[PDB]
Amino acid sequence: TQLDIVIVLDGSNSIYPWESVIAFLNDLLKRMDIGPKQTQVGIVQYGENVTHEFNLNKYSSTEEVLVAANKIGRQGGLQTMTALGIDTARKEAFTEARGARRGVKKVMVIVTDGESHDNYRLKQVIQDCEDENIQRFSIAILGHYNRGNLSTEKFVEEIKSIASEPTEKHFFNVSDELALVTIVKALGERIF
């Protein structure tokens, strides 16, 4: 199924077992059938700033893409700029220049473990996305917050608020990093 999908991975310092985010990425990708005629994948990591791990038209094989994604290291970040990452992915990753296919449904999968420093310009960033008809799946990892005995009330609401409607369908509330590889089935099917 022809689909352009961009992963917006929060690379702040709290998502601890980094290989666990990667294990998840691997787990979600190994299921897809990538190809210029069905499913395209791109990855952007963020935290303080944004970097494109790889464009939507960079790879053609589900396997090659697998090797590429497993070599992504934690960029690191004190600040978590989700508004900046999402806006950049909508502004950059999704361009014919970076691989985006003309009239192919655009989907975003954002993964994060904390409230955004860029909290405020979310409403504008999201509404723009919804205007550019971009289905969004937001996964909130409550690990660091639960380990630190902090409320996640507002954190879950802000992440819920990024997911395309219906929120109960695209938003994923994950307990911790390890429990990520148990959300691959529902995300991988609700997507395609």
Please give the single-letter amino acid code of residue 54: F
Q: Are 92 and 84 in contact (CB under 8 A)?
A: no
Measured CA to CA, the distance from residue 155 to residue 181 in angstroms comes to: 21
Task: Name the helix (H) or strand (E) containing 85.
Answer: helix 82-88
The C-alpha angle with vertex 166 and arms to 161 and 168, in degrees rounded to 5, equals 75
Reading phi first (left if > 0) and then psi (alpha if -120 to 50, else beta), residue 172 is in: beta
State the structure-solving technique: X-ray
Residue 30 CB partners (closer than 8 Å, separation 6+): 62, 66
Q: Nominal resolution in Å?
A: 2.2
Question: Is beta strand 4-10 parallel, antiparallel or unpaired with respect to 106-112?
Answer: parallel
Dihedral angle computed from the Cα positions of residues 134, 91, 20 and 28, in that order, rounded to the nearest 10 degrees: 40
Residue 128 CB partners (closer than 8 Å, separation 6+): 87, 90
Reading phi first (left if > 0) and then psi (alpha if -120 to 50, else beta), residue 114 is in: beta
Q: Which domains does the chain have, with CATH numbers?
A: 1-192 (3.40.50.410)
Residue 99 to residues 11, 54, 87, 192: CA-CA distances in angstroms? Answer: 23, 10, 17, 19
Measured CA to CA, the distance from residue 36 to residue 128 in angstroms comes to: 26
Q: Are 72 and 41 in contact (CB under 8 A)?
A: no
Return the beta strands (E) in the chain as ranges: 4-10, 40-47, 49-54, 106-112, 134-141, 171-174
Helices then strands, each counted (H, E), the chain: 8, 6
